[PDB]
Design a protein around this ligand. Structure first.
Ligand SMILES: O=C1C=C(O)C[C@@H](C=C2c3ccccc3-c3ccccc32)O1
Length: 134
């Protein structure tokens, strides 16, 4: 048993708060915000050795990242940013920093009760996305 056991699984989005405003702060344009904001993604997390894979599947976009903790990688975000990402574990929280165009956003993912809570932060703006097991 191991580092991210409690994250592993298939998860479905059940609530979202302030996501439009988070996307605005990120720089997402109107049409992508409207369509992206409707999506109810399935997040599929798995671990094979040191490699963590997070897939997100929705009607808007399918994304996939695989990574080793602490080791920077290239990511294509759902809104089509090309970012440099680094994901670490801090006290049981996955902390994902994305850098692009001189900007930065942090996504934290944590287990809380039977949920997986995703907090997306851009400057002063937070969005909270709550997932339950599918
Ligand atoms: O791990 C997670 C789980 C979440 O529910 C949001 C997701 C991040 C994004 C995101 C970030 C910035 C701009 C757009 C989008 C977007 C648009 C559609 C679906 C998902 C996402 O990151």
């Amino acid at each position: 048993s191991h580092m991210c056991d409690a994250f592993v699984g298939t998860w479905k989005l059940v609530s979202s708060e302030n996501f439009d405003d988070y996307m605005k702060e990120v720089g997402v344009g109107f049409a992508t915000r409207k369509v992206a904001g409707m999506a109810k993604p399935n997040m599929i997390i798995s671990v094979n050795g040191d490699v963590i894979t997070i897939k997100s599947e929705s009607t808007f976009k399918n994304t996939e990242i695989s990574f080793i903790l602490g080791q920077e990688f290239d990511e294509v975000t759902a809104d089509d940013r090309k970012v440099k990402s680094t994901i670490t574990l801090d006290g049981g929280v996955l902390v994902h920093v994305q850098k692009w165009d001189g900007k930065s956003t942090t996504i934290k993912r944590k287990r809380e009760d039977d949920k997986l809570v995703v907090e997306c932060v851009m400057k002063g703006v937070t969005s909270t996305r709550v997932y339950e097991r599918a």
